[PDB]
């Protein structure tokens, strides 16, 4: 199932390409209402082939959506037993790598913080260690 | 026809009327005020409830007149309760009352 | 237009109205106490004003009559079940011959609140949660009456005043102890209270039936539940703790003290005791509490007939 | 004061809405786990986190599920403007699609900043005009054009002279 | 106690008349519950206090709950009979209505002309019903227990899912 995992399935372009504009495009109310409409009968127009699942309605399999961050997972249940599940992610995509190409080596550090926001300086550490490798810096012991 | 009995009847009537009117008036005020902009085990459980509730009503009638019925009434109610408990044990053992098999 | 019969009639009517008003205000104060423990009267006035002046929005794809009817059941069922409770000599609303039978009638009507709310709330998860909640309360209403029947057997009548007068020497909690614990369990389960709080929480296929109820309908559900605790505590007092009978204090003081104690005990039971699983709850009910009530009634009858010379 | 589109009870209703506010906290991102009811029953929506494009419809849907009157607090730079995430997958601010009553800067704000948001919203409701019923009176809301919190606190802020030096804890 | 009987009987008649001519199952069951409440009021007006108590406890409070359970479980959302609405077509209901009216006139003619000193309304308590139940009607009690057992076994054997 080679489908999109960060962006929605109705997305045009591949954002980590160099010719893709990084900064946010203009807000359209009409696209917001279109996406709300797609959320309206998402369950009614649920095809379990667009998620990699199988045996969609044996007349005993139930398909549900669910809700550390908020994310969806579609559940195939035989009664109460889980037969298959596909966790739908990308609802928290912040473009952090694309931002890494838009900030200097110094001014990217707060973005390292906001990835894994329970970590803070833990998330700072690998980035500054890799930049010090690029710069040829050996930090002192303190 | 005692005045205490008719007074209590009036008090009960006023209690029910004022209570239902209070609920209805509170919902009417909530509506008017403010501006604007399945498994078969459920059947099994409810059916067991109905059957055991009728057998419960039999025991309800027994309980208020136990002294007037004597020991023979106790024997009859003991047979009734034993049959009821045998049916309950049967339902438990065949998995009818087991919610998660 | 002056006559002492009419004075007696309006005096009893005033007593009943006072009893009703104290019960509703005491349920509201129970709501405040549970919200605070887990001015205050001004806070409840503000909340009541907010429920008044928030728009009441019935769903478009919901049946309006059933949707509006479920909160009236959840309020009025147990709030009318209070009417048999004698709080003091000469301070009962109705001295019914059926009595505790009238409490059973009101509980049997009370199951329609959860059933009607779940059906009218046009949602499959809410419907399944309502089916689970209704199955639970039927599973405990199946033995509520028999746990009461031990006390009825001892008193020899259904009248609440006769039950209280039969508790003149020994309170019923000592002989009818198993009836007492089964009645406490079933009265907690009938009011959908902790630990029987959310039977829909055991599955993501189920949601609460209080969901999609907003404004004064949600307020009606809340106040009706708290009034249900008030009347279940008062019935527990009148059936198992002598009612208003006490050695030195005035009778209403004793009744109010016992009712307040059981109200706070239900509060700490909610705060302390954890939530069992759904199948565990239904299995416990059907397999333990109903046979216990039947055996308790048999033993009570044998003891009564033995001590009759 | 200016407003943008028999009296004592209006103040009583405003007071009842003021000291009785039920929030619906929206998780979204790190602002929620810093700052820590059904949407039908809630009357304040607190949006605390990034408005990702995949879940801006969720925010708008659960806003439309709430009932009148409804107020919005936007916590943090993300919910205010997009913050530091002016990037392809982020909506630049909550107020692009739902109206906001109080804005709280920070990344994240403190919990006491949320408490100050609650106070600011409380007088915001306290001197606003909303219709009494759907049939009687003018059926229009009147939000008060309050003096800005930076204009009110300007003199005390400018009067600051010395601060503790940063070499201490 | 006469006014209560007449108003409750009129409410019961109107309620079942709206039961048999209604399309929504939950609405029909609601009108059925209203009819059962009215019939219990009729019971209380006559002095059959135990009967009215059991009418609310069991008939309107257990059996109608089973009906509501079944209705919400089968999820009737207009399965080709609500949209058809054949029972309100005159060619369908006019025959059985005249047949039932003829039976009603025959039965009512039989009811009239019988000697009648009036129903006193003196309460017959649950005490006396319990005395009769476990006295001269002991075998009725035990075989009614066996009857409810048979209903339990039949309804389990048929109505379980597997
Ligand atoms: C939206 C509205 C829907 C309908 C709501 C209710 C409609 C009726 C409301 C008005 C009632 C008027 C007053 C009724 C009479 C009260 C007095 C009475 O019943 O007295 C008779 C009897 C006395 O017995 P006792 O005192 O022991 O003996 C004396 C000896 N002759 O005492 C008895 O027999 C008492 C037993 C009968 C008590 C009936 C109480 C009301 C039952 C309805 C509850 C509704 C619950 C919510 C809705 C459920 C779902 C629809
Ligand atoms: C008014 C116009 C219609 C308005 C809408 C409908 C409202 C409900 C009307 C029916 C119910 C109330 C009828 C009036 C009862 C008033 C009380 C009364 O008559 O009491 C007399 C008697 C008291 O007992 P007793 O001791 O025998 O009296 C003789 C003196 N010793 O009493 C008795 O023996 C028993 C009294 C009756 C039993 C209790 C009440 C039953 C209520 C059933 C409600 C059914 C559902 C109603 C739904 C309404 C909406 C559609
Ligand atoms: C008054 C004192 C009586 C003392 C002796 C009591 C025991 C002897 C009489 C027992 C009668 C039992 C009748 C049971 C009938 C069961 C019928 C079941 C049908 C399925
Ligand atoms: C939770 C308690 C609910 C009580 C509901 C009824 C309240 C009735 C109040 C009656 C007060 C007077 C009682 C008779 C006089 C004896 C007591 C005098 C001192 C209070
Ligand atoms: S404003 Fe800062 S802390 Fe708040 S959600 Fe955005 S990145 Fe996280």
Automatic annotation (TrEMBL), chain A:
Residue ranges that the Swiss-Prot or TrEMBL entry lists as coiled coil: none
Subcellular location: Cell inner membrane; Cell membrane
Role: NDH-1 shuttles electrons from NADH, via FMN and iron-sulfur (Fe-S) centers, to quinones in the respiratory chain. The immediate electron acceptor for the enzyme in this species is believed to be ubiquinone. Couples the redox reaction to proton translocation (for every two electrons transferred, four hydrogen ions are translocated across the cytoplasmic membrane), and thus conserves the redox energy in a proton gradient.
Assembly with partners or alone: NDH-1 is composed of 13 different subunits. Subunits NuoB, CD, E, F, and G constitute the peripheral sector of the complex.
Family label: In the C-terminal section; belongs to the complex I 49 kDa subunit family. In the N-terminal section; belongs to the complex I 30 kDa subunit family.
Name of the protein: NADH-quinone oxidoreductase subunit C/D
Organism of provenance: Escherichia coli
Parent-protein residues present: 150 to 298 of 596
UniProtKB/TrEMBL annotation, chain E:
Source species, domain of life: Bacteria
One matching Pfam family: Oxidored_q3
PANTHER family assigned: NADH-UBIQUINONE OXIDOREDUCTASE CHAIN 6
Phylogenetic placement of the source organism: Bacteria, Pseudomonadati, Pseudomonadota, Gammaproteobacteria, Enterobacterales
Record's subunit section: Composed of 13 different subunits. Subunits NuoA, H, J, K, L, M, N constitute the membrane sector of the complex.
InterPro entries in the cross-refs: NADH_UbQ/plastoQ_OxRdtase_su6 (IPR001457), Nuo/plastoQ_OxRdtase_6_NuoJ (IPR042106)
Transmembrane feature ranges: 28-49, 56-74, 94-112, 133-158
Function statement: NDH-1 shuttles electrons from NADH, via FMN and iron-sulfur (Fe-S) centers, to quinones in the respiratory chain. The immediate electron acceptor for the enzyme in this species is believed to be ubiquinone. Couples the redox reaction to proton translocation (for every two electrons transferred, four hydrogen ions are translocated across the cytoplasmic membrane), and thus conserves the redox energy in a proton gradient. NDH-1 shuttles electrons from NADH, via FMN and iron-sulfur (Fe-S) centers, to quinones in the respiratory chain. Couples the redox reaction to proton translocation (for every two electrons transferred, four hydrogen ions are translocated across the cytoplasmic membrane), and thus conserves the redox energy in a proton gradient.
Catalyses which reaction(s): a quinone + NADH + 5 H(+)(in) = a quinol + NAD(+) + 4 H(+)(out)
Record protein name field: NADH-quinone oxidoreductase subunit J
Top-tier EC class: translocase
Family, as annotated: Belongs to the complex I subunit 6 family.
Any single GO CC term annotated in Swiss-Prot or TrEMBL for this entry: plasma membrane
Keywords tagged on the record: Cell membrane, Membrane, NAD, Quinone, Translocase, Transmembrane, Transmembrane helix, Ubiquinone
Predominant subcellular localization, coarse grouping: membrane
Catalytic activity, EC: 7.1.1.-
Entry's localization field: Cell membrane
One term of GO molecular function: NADH dehydrogenase (ubiquinone) activity
Membrane topology value: Multi-pass membrane protein
């Amino acid at each position: 199932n080679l489908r999109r995992i960060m962006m929605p399935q109705t997305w045009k372009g591949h954002p980590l390409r160099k010719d893709y504009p990084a900064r946010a495009t203009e807000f359209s109310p009409f696209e917001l209402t279109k996406a709300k409409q797609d959320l309206e009968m998402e369950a009614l127009t649920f095809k379990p082939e667009e998620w990699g699942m199988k045996r969609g309605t044996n007349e005993d399999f139930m398909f549900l959506n669910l809700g550390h961050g908020a994310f969806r997972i579609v559940l195939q249940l035989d009664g109460e037993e889980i037969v298959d599940c596909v966790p739908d992610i990308g609802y928290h995509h912040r473009g952090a790598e694309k931002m890494g190409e838009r900030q200097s080596w110094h001014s990217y550090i707060p973005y390292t913080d906001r990835i894994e926001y329970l970590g803070g300086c833990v998330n700072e550490m690998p980035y500054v260690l890799a930049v010090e490798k690029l710069a040829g810096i050996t930090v002192p012991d303190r | 026809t005692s005045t205490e009995v008719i007074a209590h009847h009036w008090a009960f009537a006023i209690f029910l009327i004022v209570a239902i009117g209070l609920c209805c008036l509170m919902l009417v005020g909530g509506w008017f005020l403010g501006g604007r902009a399945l498994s078969a085990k459920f059947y099994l459980v409810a059916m067991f409830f109905v059957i055991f509730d009728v057998e419960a009503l039999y025991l309800f009638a027994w309980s208020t007149s136990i002294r007037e019925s004597g020991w023979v009434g106790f024997v009859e109610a003991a047979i009734f309760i034993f049959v009821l408990l045998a049916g309950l044990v049967y339902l438990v053992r065949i998995g009818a009352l087991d919610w998660t098999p | 237009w002056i006559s002492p019969e009419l004075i007696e009639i309006l005096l009893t009517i005033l007593k009943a109205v006072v009893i009703l008003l104290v019960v509703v205000t005491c349920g509201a104060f129970m709501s405040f106490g549970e919200r605070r423990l887990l001015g205050g009267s001004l806070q409840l006035v503000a909340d009541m004003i907010k429920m008044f002046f928030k728009e009441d929005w019935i769903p478009k794809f919901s049946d309006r009559v059933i949707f509006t009817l479920a909160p009236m059941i959840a309020f009025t069922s147990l709030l009318l079940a209070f009417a048999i409770v004698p709080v003091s000599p000469g301070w009962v609303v109705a001295d019914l011959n059926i009595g505790i039978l009238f409490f059973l009638m009101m509980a049997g009507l009370a199951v329609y609140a959860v059933l009607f709310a779940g059906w009218s709330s046009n949602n499959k998860y809410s419907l399944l949660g309502a089916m689970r909640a209704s199955a639970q309360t039927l599973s405990y209403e199946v033995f509520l009456g028999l746990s009461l029947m031990g006390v009825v057997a001892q008193a020899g009548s259904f009248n609440m005043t006769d039950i209280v007068n039969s508790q003149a020497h020994v309170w019923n909690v000592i002989p009818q102890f198993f009836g007492f614990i089964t009645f406490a369990i079933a009265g907690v389960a009938v009011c959908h209270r902790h630990p029987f709080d959310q039977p829909e929480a055991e599955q993501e296929l189920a949601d609460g039936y209080h969901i999609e109820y907003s404004g004064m309908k949600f307020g009606l559900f809340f106040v009706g539940e708290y009034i249900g605790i008030v009347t279940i505590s008062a019935l527990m007092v009148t059936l198992f703790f002598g009612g208003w009978q006490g050695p030195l204090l005035p009778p209403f003081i004793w009744f109010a003290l016992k009712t307040a104690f059981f109200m706070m005990m239900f509060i700490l039971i909610r705060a302390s005791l954890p939530r069992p699983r759904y199948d565990q709850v239904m299995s416990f009910g059907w397999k333990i509490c109903l046979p216990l009530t039947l055996i308790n009634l048999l033993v009570t009858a044998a003891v009564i007939l033995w001590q009759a010379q | 004061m200016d407003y943008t589109l028999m009296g004592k009870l209006n103040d009583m209703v405003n007071w009842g809405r003021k000291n009785s506010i039920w929030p619906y906290n929206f998780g979204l991102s790190c602002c929620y786990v810093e700052m820590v009811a059904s949407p039908r029953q809630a009357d304040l929506m607190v949006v605390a986190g990034t408005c990702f494009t995949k879940m801006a419809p969720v925010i708008q849907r659960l806003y439309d599920q709430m009932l009148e009157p409804k107020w919005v607090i936007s916590m943090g730079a993300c919910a205010n403007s997009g913050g530091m995430y002016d990037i392809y997958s982020v909506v630049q601010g909550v107020d692009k699609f739902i109206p906001v009553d109080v804005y709280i800067p920070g990344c994240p704000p403190r919990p006491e900043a949320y408490m100050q948001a609650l106070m600011l919203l409380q007088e915001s409701i306290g001197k606003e005009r909303r219709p009494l019923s759907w049939v009687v009176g003018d059926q229009g809301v009147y939000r008060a054009n309050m003096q800005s919190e930076r204009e009110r606190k300007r003199g005390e802020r400018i009067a600051v002279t010395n601060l503790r030096t940063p070499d201490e804890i | 106690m006469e006014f209560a009987f007449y108003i409750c009987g009129l409410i019961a008649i109107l309620a079942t008349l709206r039961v048999i001519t209604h399309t929504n199952p939950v609405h029909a069951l609601l009108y059925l519950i209203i009819s059962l409440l009215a019939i219990s009021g009729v019971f209380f007006s006559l002095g059959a206090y135990f009967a009215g108590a059991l009418e609310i406890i069991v008939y309107a409070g257990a059996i109608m709950v089973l009906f509501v359970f079944v209705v919400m479980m089968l999820n009737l959302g207009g399965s080709e009979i609500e949209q058809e609405r054949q029972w309100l077509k005159p060619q369908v209901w006019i025959g059985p209505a005249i047949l039932s009216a003829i039976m009603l006139v025959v039965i009512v003619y039989a009811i009239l002309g019988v000697n009648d000193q009036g129903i006193d309304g003196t309460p017959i308590s649950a005490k006396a019903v319990g005395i009769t139940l476990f006295g001269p009607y002991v075998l009725a009690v035990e075989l009614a227990s066996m009857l409810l057992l048979a209903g339990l076994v039949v309804a389990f054997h048929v109505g379980r899912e597997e």
